[PDB]
Amino acid sequence: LHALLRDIPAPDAEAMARTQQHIDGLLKPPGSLGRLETLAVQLAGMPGLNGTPQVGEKAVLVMCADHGVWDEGVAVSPKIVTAIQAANMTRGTTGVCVLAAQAGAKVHVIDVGIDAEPIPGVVNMRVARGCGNIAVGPAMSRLQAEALLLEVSRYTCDLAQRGVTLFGVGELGMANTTPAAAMVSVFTGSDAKEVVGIGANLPPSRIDNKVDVVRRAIAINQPNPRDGIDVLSKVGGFDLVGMTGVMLGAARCGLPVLLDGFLSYSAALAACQIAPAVRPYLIPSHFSAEKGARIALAHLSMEPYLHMAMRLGEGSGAALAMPIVEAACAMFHNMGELAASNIVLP
Amino acid sequence: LHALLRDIPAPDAEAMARTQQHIDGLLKPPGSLGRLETLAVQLAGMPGLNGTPQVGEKAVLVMCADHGVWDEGVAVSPKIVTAIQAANMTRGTTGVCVLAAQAGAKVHVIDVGIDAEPIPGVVNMRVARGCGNIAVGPAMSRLQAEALLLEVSRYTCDLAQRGVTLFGVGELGMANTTPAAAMVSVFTGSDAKEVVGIGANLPPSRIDNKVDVVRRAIAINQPNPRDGIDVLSKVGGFDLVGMTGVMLGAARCGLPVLLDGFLSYSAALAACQIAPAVRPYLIPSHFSAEKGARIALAHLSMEPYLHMAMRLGEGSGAALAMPIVEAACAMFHNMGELAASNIVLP
C-alpha cells in the first residue's frame, strides 16, 4: 500500500505545454472555450492518456454498503433499499444505469459491505454485513480500511489494462450522508450544523438528531484529521473507503476520475489527505444539492461544471459529465487552425 | 407576422401533470434528480413533442452577419473573419461544428447579412452587405426587421416538418457584442458600463470606447424598450434579428430552443418582449463569460446548467447542452419504478 502511494505519477508538464500551444492555435479567439480548454490540458498531462486528451472506454464504479448508524434514525429510506437497488443496478433500471448508457459507459456494481445475502451479478468485495455504528464506535478497523483500499485500487487499475481510460465513482448505502458529513466536518474543521443536509428527503424536524449523531461520532472516535485512513476507518464506511480506493487506483494508473456528489467529495478529501498526488487526477462533475457541498468543494478547490440540483448519488452526476470530457477531446482533435484560414489575431 | 405571434401555443398543462406523476414514481427519492426532472416536465408541456419528453433530430441554426459599428474600433477581429468562418462552417472545422457532431446535431449556416460575396453552401437570406452602424443611426428599417423575422421563423418551423424536435441558436458576426450590449442595456435599464464586456479579447484599454459607442447608439436612436422590434431594428443587427426569429419560429411550432451565450440572451430578451408566449419554449445552456451575462440572465429569470466560462459563440454552448436534454428524456423513459421493486418511501 505504501508502494501504491509511492508510485503515483506526477502530471506530464511537457505534454501539457504541447497541448496548450495546440489549443491556442485552433479556429477561435484564444481562451474563448474557457474550461473546455483547461480540461483538455489537464487530461493531456495524465500519463495513462498517452500525451493527448483522449477517451477510450468509460466505466462507473458503484460502491455499495450498509451502515450501523442507520439505527440512529438518521435516514427515512428503509435499510433494505441498498440491497434492492444493488440488484436493480444489475438490470440497468437505475438512474446511474440509464445515464451511463446514454454516455456509453459501463456500470460496475461492487458490494463492499451490504447487509444482506450476496447478490448475484454484483462484484463481491464485502468486508462485512454493514459497518459499525459510528455513533458509538468506529466504522471498522484500520486494517480493514487498508485492505479494502488495496483491493479496490487494484481492481481499478486492472480495468485500465482492458481499455478503460475514464472512471466515474458512485455509491449506494442508506444513511451514508451521515458518515459523509462527519468526514467533511473533520477534514474542513467545519461545525456539524454547517455540513449536515437532508440527504434522501430527511424531514426537517429530524435534522437536529442527525447533527447530534455526527457530533457524537466525532467526540467518541476522536478521528485524526491529518490521518485520512484514520478518519475513514473511524467515521467513514465501506462505501466511502471503496470510493477513495477508486481514486487512488486511477491516480496510480495515471488516469482521470470524475467525482459525483457530496458522498464523493467526502471520499476525495480523504484521498487527497492520504496522497496529495491524487488531486490532479480528479475532475468534478456537478454541484450537489446537499447542504455541505459548498464547503467540501471549497476545500478541494474545485468548481463543478454542472448545476443541476441533483442529489441522487449512485454516480449519476459522474455519468452525466462524461460527454463533457469527450467534448474537450473532440475540440482538441477535430477543430481546424487559424493559420490554415490565414486568420491573424493580435 | 401578427398571425404568427397570435398562434403561439400555450404549454400543455395536462401533459405536464402526467409527466410529473410519472417522474415521481421512478426508482429514486422524489425530486432527487432536481433540474433534470423539471426539464423533463418542461419538455412534456411543449405541443410539438407529442405529450412526452422526447428528442428526434437536432439542429443548430447559425445566423451570420456583419455590422457597420465595426468601424468604431469596438472589435480586434478583422471584419473578414465573418465570411471566413461562415465558409469554415461548411467544412465542419469550427467549434460549433465539432460540438454539434459530438451531439449528433446538424449545423445550418444562414447568411443574413455578411459583407462579402455569397458563400456557396450557405443558406442565403441576406438582407444587406452588413447592417448600418448603430453609432450614428439605425441598424436597419423596421420593415427589414419584420421581413427577416418572418422568413427565419418560417424556415425554422419548416425544419420541424422534417423531424427536427430540438433547436439550438447561434451567431457569427465580428463586433456583435456591441449591439448585444446596447440591447441588454435598453431592455434591462442597466447602465452601459455594467453590460459591456471584452467580447473577443478586446484589450482592456479599448473598453472605454466600446462603452461610449453603446451610449451614443442609444442616445441617437432612442429605441423604445417596450417595443422589441423597435429595439432590434435600431440598435440590433441582422444576426440578432435572425436569432430572435428562430425563437419565434420554434415557439410557434411548439418546440424547444436551446440558448447559447450573451448574444443569444440579447435575442431572447427581444423575443420575450415581442411575445411573452415564447418564454416557456426557451432552455438555457451555459453561463457565458461575458460581463453582462448575469444581468441578462436575471431578466430572463434563467439559470444555466453549464458553467464553462465559454465565450466563443456560434451556438457552441447550445450544442454542448444537447446531451443534457437527451438525458432528461432517457431518465423519463428508461428508469424503473419504485412500486415494481416494492419500494415504499414515506
Swiss-Prot record, chains A, B:
Domain of life: Bacteria
Binding site for substrate: Q85
Site (Important for substrate positioning, might be proton acceptor): E171, E314
Source organism (scientific name): Salmonella typhimurium (strain LT2 / SGSC1412 / ATCC 700720)
Signal sequence coordinates: none
Protein name from the UniProt record: Nicotinate-nucleotide--dimethylbenzimidazole phosphoribosyltransferase
Other information: In vitro assays of this enzyme are performed at pH 10 because at physiological pH (7.0) its activity is undetectable; this makes it difficult to assess the role of mutagenesis of potential proton acceptor active site residues (Glu-171 and Glu-314).
Entry's EC annotation: 2.4.2.21
Reactions this protein catalyses: 5,6-dimethylbenzimidazole + nicotinate beta-D-ribonucleotide = alpha-ribazole 5'-phosphate + nicotinate + H(+)
Disruption of the gene: reported phenotype: No growth on cobinamide (CBI); double cobB-cobT deletion mutants do not grow on CBI and DMB.
InterPro entries given in the database record: Nict_dMeBzImd_PRibTrfase (IPR003200), Nict_dMeBzImd_PRibTrfase_bact (IPR017846), Nict_dMeBzImd_PRibTrfase_N (IPR023195), Nict_dMeBzImd_PRibTrfase_sf (IPR036087)
Keywords: Cobalamin biosynthesis, Glycosyltransferase, Nucleotide-binding, Transferase
Record annotation: effect of changing L172M: Alters specificity to use phenolic compounds as substrate
Sites where the protein binds nicotinate beta-D-ribonucleotide: E171, L172, G173, M174, A175, N176, T177, A200, F262, S288, R311, L312
Subunit structure, as described in the record: Homodimer.
Pathway noted in the entry: Nucleoside biosynthesis; alpha-ribazole biosynthesis; alpha-ribazole from 5,6-dimethylbenzimidazole: step 1/2
Function: Catalyzes the synthesis of alpha-ribazole-5'-phosphate from nicotinate mononucleotide (NAMN) and 5,6-dimethylbenzimidazole (DMB). Able to use a variety of other nucleotide bases as substrate to create alternative lower ligands for cobamide.
Family: Belongs to the CobT family.
